Ligand binder design. Structure first.
Ligand SMILES: [Zn+2]
Ligand SMILES: [Zn+2]
Ligand SMILES: [Zn+2]
Ligand SMILES: [Zn+2]
Ligand SMILES: [Zn+2]
Ligand SMILES: [Zn+2]
Ligand SMILES: [Zn+2]
Ligand SMILES: [Zn+2]
Lengths: 266, 264, 266, 265
């Protein structure tokens, strides 16, 4: 037979790889990723926390932005993740090597990260990345504290079994701001009904819609800024049209029901 | 200016050209592609696979196994020359689809568990789905399946974990000593004063001697061209495949010339 | 000052270590563990499945009983677990080395098994065993099939975050029998309320009681046979007074409620 | 039959569990373990390095001694190991959880550490401990640097496949001192000849005696202080009779040869 196909690279839109300067979200919280991939730096008194890292090739850019914020590589103490796909956990292994930071994640995210996103429930081996290990396993509702800032995990399975929202409270213009970093609620091209690899997918999504609606949140952020109507490119107006947690979940549930209609009706 | 896109590990088309099983000995078959070796050894208590080639080769391997009368669940063991993507590529998928166990030395195990990432020389350029080794083996250790004994010979250099495997089969009932020896190339490697591999030169030099000392009637290699095999024709037509001495001699001559150019 | 304490072994009641010959539970299902620890062998024409293995020192006994049942080590295909504590997953690492089995378990069980039971949420490092890796991660309700017998996973977290019940249909004198191997519902010495290492423990147990009551079950077995009133020592009469899923869950929940009340007000 | 045996804990000589206050070895190097188990703390301006940790139950003691040395848990950057048996790597998993330190080890030590010392080539499952992962895999001769102090690895397989000596240069009285922390060369109850799990054991031990003799060394230390004739209980006189690398390897090789002779006979 004809030769087997060549391996396929994980190519993404240029805006996902467009570097940007740090954009201040709150007094201690900064977007340091790219224009279209969120990576949040929280600077505490006893080191910095990174939430998500973006694509594999973004490790150097993250370290450069950390430098501009006054954070040396060894000052990064903790990495948290929304979910362990290649476009959000991509550079985690290299970040651990170059910073010594620990990774805290739930068990589902830990096992997916440790196999580099391979054998994905829905993508197979289509999107892999260098594997990394979690140094601390997190339970639902558990609180991780760095330098006086408490980060609370809220499991919201669906997009991945391990999908998690993280919440914390910063300050902004003299007042506290409850920040919620919620994972994706989409099911892009997923088989929703009767999926042998995820039998309770529909029940998990539906509960996760409700979990997101209930998060303590004055300011919602998402791994893809477009999903919560952020525009990182417009500077200090980046959050002008940012969605509430209610609007984010409702839009997600409406799309999910219609995606379920396209499937169930056939 | 956006960051660079990721690049896929692309190979010569003949590396990906399927072939029907080619008989090497009474129970030993090449079942990979024209230019990547994957050896199937059929025993009384199931099959052994030595290397799998590229990651996209899993289905092809299983199809050739079926043509040989080996159901997926009959694959009992996977052995490896070294844990690079073009030889260990489909190991994770093969484990999931067969239940086979992997046996490898510690160095190969850690690189396989990394999916080839953070390679001493390639960094993250040549990666593949990670897999775990179920049995760690030591230099000279014997693994027996169905009364066929496979002996490991460590030959570090191309990777720290590079291994040769030897076993005895028959050709029409007469015993034949088969040696499956890893690569001895250092493609683009910094040889002298490499911070990530300080004793590289010493290891290659010991490994040339290890290969020459292997018990061997027939030598095969992960890239058939490295031992003058032509998988396009029958195995008896490959009489003039290289001996262990000639294979190591050729590799040592290239290594010495590369070292000289680097020192100059 | 005084020397540090010596390490302490995990010692158990003698009956947990008392070998027994294989006891037929259904036409293809055998108890092959000890008098007071369940280890179920399910034999198909395409190989065997082992559900649990007991304590670490039981490996050789299990292999001896497999040989009496005509299962060569290479024909044990799969190991399933109720939960990853030393008295149920004890010999898994050794069994994997000595057989052709792979382990299928959920992510929580996978991460605890790979720690050898160390850093347990409730037990610390007091009850440990040789680490093993799960080869296949399974999801709630996922079906694993060996030789025509389908095994369905039902997550029932609480005793451990990864606690799982497994169900399958066998036959018993001419008629189908729905077997349920339900995990422990005990909370021995656990802090139930406001546990920073398991914040949703009470909610998980409460849901797990209902999960067990709903399992497809004509014949219940448990990792500790006493918990479902089996008496393996008497042979053919071992099942004569076995509990239903309802009675098992009701008994566990009555004890859980009294423990939580004790924790609420002494 | 009669019941199966109970599990048996790895109990040790109580002197191995006897806490001691930190003993200064050189200007930046301190013994912080117990009277009969070495655990070396190297303090730098960029954090600290721990070489070995002793038994599993020593984690709290190590951290208390670190605090006496001014090293907070988050100040520990790196853990190095001689070998991954329970009485030297015992508390590594707990130390990683409580400090955030990385582990650097060769591939053999990394795989043994990751299975908690289980399935040991010689001891089976008798000496298990909580497993840990290595965060950096190192090669023979590789240099790891923390705060300007360079640590070089020298593989000396035999006692375990992954057995490693670590060398670094410190100062004492304004002069360099080349410190060598060499692993065990013992073979306690080992089948030396024709061992199916370690076929080249004798060749590896013989090469490792030579490797130890060749180490750069003004001051030798060992995981068991008695093996290099240290006495940690006498403070400033602790090293007064410490062996050279030559003497240590010669004594170990003489013992090894007599052991091999009795086995062959
Ligand atoms: Zn995703
Ligand atoms: Zn995404
Ligand atoms: Zn290669
Ligand atoms: Zn190659
Ligand atoms: Zn338990
Ligand atoms: Zn139990
Ligand atoms: Zn030892
Ligand atoms: Zn020792």
């Amino acid at each position: 037979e004809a030769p087997l196909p060549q391996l396929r690279a994980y190519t993404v839109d240029a805006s996902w790889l467009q570097p940007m300067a740090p954009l201040q979200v709150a007094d201690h919280t900064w977007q340091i990723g790219t224009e279209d991939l969120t990576a949040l730096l929280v600077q505490t008194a006893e080191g910095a926390v990174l939430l998500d890292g973006g694509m594999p090739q973004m490790a150097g850019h993250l370290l450069d932005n950390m430098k501009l914020r006054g954070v040396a590589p060894q000052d990064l103490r903790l990495i948290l993740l929304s979910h362990a796909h290649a476009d959000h956990a991509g550079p985690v292994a290299e970040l651990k090597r170059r910073t010594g930071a620990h990774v805290a994640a739930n068990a589902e995210t830990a096992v997916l990260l440790a196999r580099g996103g391979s054998n994905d429930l829905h993508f197979g081996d289509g999107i892999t990345y260098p594997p990394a290990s979690a140094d601390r396993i997190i339970m639902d509702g558990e609180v991780v504290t760095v330098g006086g800032i408490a980060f609370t995990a809220h499991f919201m399975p669906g997009h991945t079994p391990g999908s998690t929202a993280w919440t914390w409270t910063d300050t902004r213009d003299g007042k506290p701001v409850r920040i919620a970093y919620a994972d994706s609620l989409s099911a892009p091209g997923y088989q929703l009904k009767g999926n042998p690899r995820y039998p309770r997918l529909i029940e998990d999504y539906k509960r996760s819609f409700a979990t997101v609606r209930a998060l303590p949140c004055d300011l919602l952020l998402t791994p893809h800024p477009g999903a919560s109507n952020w525009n990182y490119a417009v500077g200090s107006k980046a959050s002008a049209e940012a969605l509430t947690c209610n609007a984010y979940a409702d839009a997600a549930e409406k799309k999910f029901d219609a995606q379920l209609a396209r499937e169930t009706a056939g």
